Amino acid sequence: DDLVDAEGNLVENGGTYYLLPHIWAHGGGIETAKTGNEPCPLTVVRSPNEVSKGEPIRISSQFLSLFIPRGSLVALGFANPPSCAASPWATVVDSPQGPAVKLSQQKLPEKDILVFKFEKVSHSNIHVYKLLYCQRDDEDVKCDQYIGIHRDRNGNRRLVVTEENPLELVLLKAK
């Protein structure tokens, strides 16, 4: 069983998608914001605008195949990343508030990038996924945490590792 997009078509490996909430009242798509003493927008957030599709995100499987098997590790890359980032890849990095999804000004190894999995949320006609964060040690993988939303002091809806508001997403093909 492969990953399926919001329109019912298989997700294409390396293709670009908007990551939208299943419940549109939860906000819009995925984007970036500058927080703390960041020099540029490195914090990955969900748009507070329910009409916004956010940024196109490239979803790249650990496997060199046309589609994405459901248990595949994936990397999430901004199609149009902020110019200050060293690469387009969003990863989990420690923040002063705890592990959070961010872009980086450092080039990261594959073991820090291929760290996500989409987990199908049991039924609904439209394919809805939670976003797992996976530990890696050599060949071993443990996906025991989720990505969810933490609203900061300034009202940014940050993507963080947490059990608070676990994301449930639909994947809409960008064009």
UniProtKB/Swiss-Prot annotation:
Full-sequence portion shown in this chain: 26 to 200 of 207
Family: Belongs to the protease inhibitor I3 (leguminous Kunitz-type inhibitor) family.
Cystine connections: 40-84, 134-143
Name recorded for this polypeptide: Chymotrypsin inhibitor 3
Keywords for this protein: Disulfide bond, Protease inhibitor, Serine protease inhibitor, Signal
Residues annotated as site: Reactive bond for chymotrypsin: 64-65
An example Gene Ontology molecular-function term: serine-type endopeptidase inhibitor activity
Superkingdom of source: Eukaryota
Physiological role: Inhibits alpha-chymotrypsin at the molar ratio of 1:2 in state of 1:1.
